[PDB]
């Protein structure tokens, strides 16, 4: 199950900037942001937060959805969680990809999602499949 699902219309996404889609039964987000598409896992990897209702914003130079719940930043490009280490200047760090990103492509105006297998393990996948609670 990793070839294209057609998940809509170029015209469609543009307007909003995001849309959600149900890709191979994994739902998942797509941003449109500075002329790039982006899609991941929908679901927080942190508790299970509503990704598809969060802001976008730049962080150390990097576009990140902020999870509208406990405003977790997670870079849009890799699905890295972000953050700043401070020593009571800040520093910003990483902790790898916590959050799974697809692969989006456009062709004759249509935005087509294939799942990826890279990495071998994202922490979003338990929030992605079967028998889970989410936590506010
Ligand atoms: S569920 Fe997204 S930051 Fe906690």
Redesign the pocket.
């Known amino acids: 199950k990793y070839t294209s699902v057609c998940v809509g219309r170029e015209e469609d996404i543009r307007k909003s900037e995001r849309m959600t889609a149900v890709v191979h039964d994994r739902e998942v987000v797509i941003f449109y942001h500075k002329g790039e598409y982006h899609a991941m896992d929908i679901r927080?990897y942190?508790?299970?937060?509503p990704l598809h209702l969060g802001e976008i914003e730049d962080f150390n130079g990097q576009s990140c959805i902020v999870?509208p719940?406990?405003?977790?930043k997670i870079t849009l490009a890799t699905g890295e969680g972000l953050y700043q280490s401070i020593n009571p200047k800040p520093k910003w760090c990483s902790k790898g990809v916590k959050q799974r990103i697809h692969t989006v492509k456009v062709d004759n105006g249509n935005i087509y999602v294939t799942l990826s297998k890279e990495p071998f393990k994202c922490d979003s996948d338990y929030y992605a499949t079967g028998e889970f609670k989410v936590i506010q």
């Open positions: 927080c942190h508790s299970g937060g999870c719940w406990h405003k977790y």
